[PDB]
Design a protein around this nucleic acid. Sequence first.
RNA 1: CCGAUAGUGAACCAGUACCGUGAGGGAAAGGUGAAAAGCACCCCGGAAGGGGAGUGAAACAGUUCCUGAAACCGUGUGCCUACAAGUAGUUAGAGCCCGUUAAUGGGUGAUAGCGUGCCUUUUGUAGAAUGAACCGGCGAGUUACGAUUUGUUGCAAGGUUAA
RNA 2: AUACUCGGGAGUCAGACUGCGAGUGAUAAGAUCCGUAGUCGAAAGGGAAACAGCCCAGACCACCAGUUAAGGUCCCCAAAUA
RNA 3: GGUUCGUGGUAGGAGAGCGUUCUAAGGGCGGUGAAGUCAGACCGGAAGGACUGGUGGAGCGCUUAGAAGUGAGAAUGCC
Lengths: 110, 154, 47, 116, 101, 53, 142
Amino acid sequence: TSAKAVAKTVRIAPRKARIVIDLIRGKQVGEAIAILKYTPRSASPIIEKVLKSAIANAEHNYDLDINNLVVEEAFVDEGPTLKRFRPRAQGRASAINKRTSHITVVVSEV
Amino acid sequence: NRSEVRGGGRKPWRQKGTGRARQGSIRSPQWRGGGVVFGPTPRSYAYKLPKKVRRLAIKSILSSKVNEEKLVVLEGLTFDAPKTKEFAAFLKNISVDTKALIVVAGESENVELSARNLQGITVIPAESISVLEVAKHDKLIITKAAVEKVEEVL
Amino acid sequence: LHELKPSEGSRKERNRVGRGTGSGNGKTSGRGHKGQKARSGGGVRLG
Amino acid sequence: PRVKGGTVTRKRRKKIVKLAKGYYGSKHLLFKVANQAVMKSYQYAYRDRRQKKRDFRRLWIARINAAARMQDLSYSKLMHGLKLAGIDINRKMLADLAVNDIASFNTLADSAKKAL
Amino acid sequence: MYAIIETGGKQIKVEAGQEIYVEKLAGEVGDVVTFDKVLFVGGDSAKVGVPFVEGATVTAKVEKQGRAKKLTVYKYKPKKNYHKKQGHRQPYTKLTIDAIN
Amino acid sequence: AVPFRRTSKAKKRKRRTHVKLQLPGMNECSNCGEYRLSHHVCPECGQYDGKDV
Amino acid sequence: RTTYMAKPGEVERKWYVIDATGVSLGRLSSEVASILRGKNKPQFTPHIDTGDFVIIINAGKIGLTGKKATDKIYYRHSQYPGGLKSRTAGEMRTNNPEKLLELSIKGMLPKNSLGRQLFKKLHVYGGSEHEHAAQQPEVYEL
RNA sequence: CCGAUAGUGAACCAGUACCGUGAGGGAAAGGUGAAAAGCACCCCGGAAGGGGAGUGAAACAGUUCCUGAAACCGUGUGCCUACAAGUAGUUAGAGCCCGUUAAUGGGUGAUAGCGUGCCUUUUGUAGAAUGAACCGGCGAGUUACGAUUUGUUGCAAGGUUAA
RNA sequence: AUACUCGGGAGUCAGACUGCGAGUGAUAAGAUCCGUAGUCGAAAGGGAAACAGCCCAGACCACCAGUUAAGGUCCCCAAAUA
RNA sequence: GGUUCGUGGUAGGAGAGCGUUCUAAGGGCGGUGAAGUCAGACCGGAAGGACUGGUGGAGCGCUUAGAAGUGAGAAUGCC
Ligand SMILES: [Mg+2]
Ligand SMILES: [Mg+2]
Ligand SMILES: [Mg+2]
Ligand SMILES: [Mg+2]
Ligand SMILES: [Mg+2]
Ligand SMILES: [Mg+2]
Ligand SMILES: [Mg+2]
Ligand SMILES: [Mg+2]
Ligand SMILES: [Mg+2]
Ligand SMILES: [Mg+2]
Ligand SMILES: [Mg+2]
Ligand SMILES: [Mg+2]
Ligand SMILES: [Mg+2]
Ligand SMILES: [Mg+2]
Ligand SMILES: [Mg+2]
Ligand SMILES: [Mg+2]
Ligand SMILES: [Mg+2]
Ligand SMILES: [Mg+2]
Ligand SMILES: [Mg+2]
Ligand SMILES: [Mg+2]
Ligand SMILES: [Mg+2]
Ligand SMILES: [Mg+2]
Ligand SMILES: [Mg+2]
Ligand SMILES: [Mg+2]
Ligand SMILES: [Mg+2]
Ligand SMILES: [Mg+2]
Ligand SMILES: [Mg+2]
Ligand SMILES: [Mg+2]
Ligand SMILES: [Mg+2]
Ligand SMILES: [Mg+2]
Ligand SMILES: [Mg+2]
Ligand SMILES: [Mg+2]
Ligand SMILES: [Mg+2]
Ligand SMILES: [Zn+2]
């Protein structure tokens, strides 16, 4: 019926992935891929590979029609955070969260 | 306690100005790996009631067993050689089929060995009869010779 | 040994202070408020 | 023997947070503000079990007043009339007649007028 | 036809076949209960009480003897370390009205 | 200088009502048959949709 | 339990027309507030609005006892520094009587969302002619 | 007696790493499965990572992998919400949506009444006094020996042993 | 319907305002210091808009019953346009 | 078992209890699913306690007594 792909622990902040994933949620996969191609954000290429993986899964594992697919679900979940430090003035160090994302895309017929 | 925990000698940071709670040692009891505030210390829990109360207690537990018909007095009890099979057969003949304290005087070393591997059964001298050993056991089996020795003391 | 009843009145549960306000001995734990007698190790010598 | 603080704490705090179901934001999630919200809800509910009794008597009286003024009586005269006439019907029952059986209410208002 | 009866320190309006909840009455679940204090009878001939209609009675059969849904009563005084929690379940009798007389 | 109170989830989410991207301005080409930004050259065909290069 | 509660659109709201000619500004207003609120109906429910619509005509002839015509001041503040404007009840009865009666009745309505709905049911006219004939308004006496 | 914030500082290559010129200070960090049977092969992808297929009792046990709470972050949507002035509830209450440990039930809440958090400290604090970002864990009248008093039990002009 | 005695266990030793009687002060102070009564402190409820200390009055729990207190009864707002 | 008078409360005195870990004895549950965890409209005057279902995958209640590292929301607490 539907096909999912996930990109786990991608080194991009979830907020930055979500602002893009919100454009493709509900679109036909052809339009979704165009939207990602012409959205100049660092998340666009990453989300494109998850979406094209989901479509390949739908065509190979579940013999679905790639011409009739819609993005049923798309969401970003928090992955494990890398903890870093930036030296600041007066010997003080400030925390830096190098956040990671789990990016899920589900495609379905209609 | 906070004195016995490794390290912890220095004040972790100055009393005033850092904006942190004032702290005296990293082994103060509210610190993660810190000293325990009271907690167990090695001590004896032993105490004896007066002798007269201890004698009344053994007299009363033994009288209870007679009232409950849980005391079996045996003429002899002896075994030619240490044999658990024989001791087990004996307990069926006497009709125990419960935990039982066996009290014996006429040395009979073969009784202790023969009953050593049975789970609910304890064999004791007679000199060694105690309130807690009688209480821990349902039936009390005692040889005539042992009864004499118990009455000789009480 | 499964039906032990110590003589009635011979044993009493100890009072534990500083275990909440319901007990009536919570917070200040029977010491009232401040002064020398509220402090750990507090109190003047006997006479 | 050591007693670690296992489970009793979580069980107690979770009950308080469940009593704060429906409260806004942090108030239905976090033990510290949920516990305040639940204590305060119980205090209001205790106060409002008393206030409810006052509120409903004010409602009934206002409805009896309206129905009685349609019979050229004020509430103060009608109630005096019913007392003199020896009629013990309470304000909740009068207010019910004034809305649901006005003919019956009018019969009582006549009994009141007669006694005045 | 409906009556107004005095039960449990309160007044209630009753028609036949109605199911009312009142303060606990003596009565097993079969038992027939007779309300003698009728304040008013309605329907095409309003019998009014001064204060009770002589001879007028409502009969009902006890359907349930129950305890209402659990109420928690909780008081506290801020800053005085005073809290008091108490459970409450008010007993009631569920009657079906049989006949206004 | 500093927040007097932490910002609630609701208030944070209301503030972000306008923090979003717009869809790109694109349409299907005739010669290519695939999507392209208007007023841009189409790489699928490999030139400007109209003007050949 | 069993106490009746009016539902929205359950109780028939009627249109009343009230001549203001001579009546003290209050006295008219206090009676009208009660009609708008629905305090004269046994169906009165405090949270619903069971009241009637009121047209006041001849508001220019409204009564002001004593020296109220010159001495009763109505104040407005714009919320700009020193932005306090004042009008006498007299001047307002001459030029803006619809405003005078609205101010007087607004003050006697509940100060809440429902009070603001009740105010919308009041129609004040300086003269004797309204344009609400379609609503078949019935004359009401105080 | 402890059972991984406990118990040693140290269950693990710990007096290590790290800090300090130095004396010295001094951590964190346990758990795949019975067995590696540790995922052939196919597919998308540069890889990572996925989806199948297979192994297995289980893979939502997949090389840090028993369980997996809360804060916190999201997706979906039953009810409400853009004329309202809100310690956020509570009491009354339509409407709409449900259907339970079956109960004078559950969710939501137009509108109406009432309503200044918790703690500490104070004569008095909603306080424009103090403390707490939140969640979790840990975190404070104990033990020994004496004194005294009450209760209990044994014996009683006696009672009791210490080493 | 309590007193007293003997034992065990306390807390308290910053008080506040109001009325009355005094001093200090200016016959000032929400001032200060005594005496005397009350309330608060440690008291929720009603009134005094709001308002520890004023007026009324003491909350064991439930009720969609009733009668009263101070204070009120044209509207906000229950009750007299008595 | 009735009658009568009571039942606001800080410091504080007095009483009765709930729950936690461990021990003993008795009696049980548990791969036909233990503890834990999640959910629920159930029960008790309170502390609290069940039941049903999901998850979990091997231990745990109950009764009576005993012993305590026995209950946290605040310490500019510690991690
Ligand atoms: Mg530097
Ligand atoms: Mg030291
Ligand atoms: Mg700070
Ligand atoms: Mg330690
Ligand atoms: Mg106790
Ligand atoms: Mg106390
Ligand atoms: Mg506290
Ligand atoms: Mg203190
Ligand atoms: Mg003191
Ligand atoms: Mg350790
Ligand atoms: Mg652990
Ligand atoms: Mg350590
Ligand atoms: Mg992992
Ligand atoms: Mg609107
Ligand atoms: Mg407006
Ligand atoms: Mg702070
Ligand atoms: Mg002693
Ligand atoms: Mg005085
Ligand atoms: Mg003074
Ligand atoms: Mg004080
Ligand atoms: Mg008061
Ligand atoms: Mg008030
Ligand atoms: Mg106060
Ligand atoms: Mg009353
Ligand atoms: Mg009266
Ligand atoms: Mg009125
Ligand atoms: Mg009382
Ligand atoms: Mg009390
Ligand atoms: Mg005590
Ligand atoms: Mg356990
Ligand atoms: Mg768990
Ligand atoms: Mg502890
Ligand atoms: Mg904390
Ligand atoms: Zn083209």
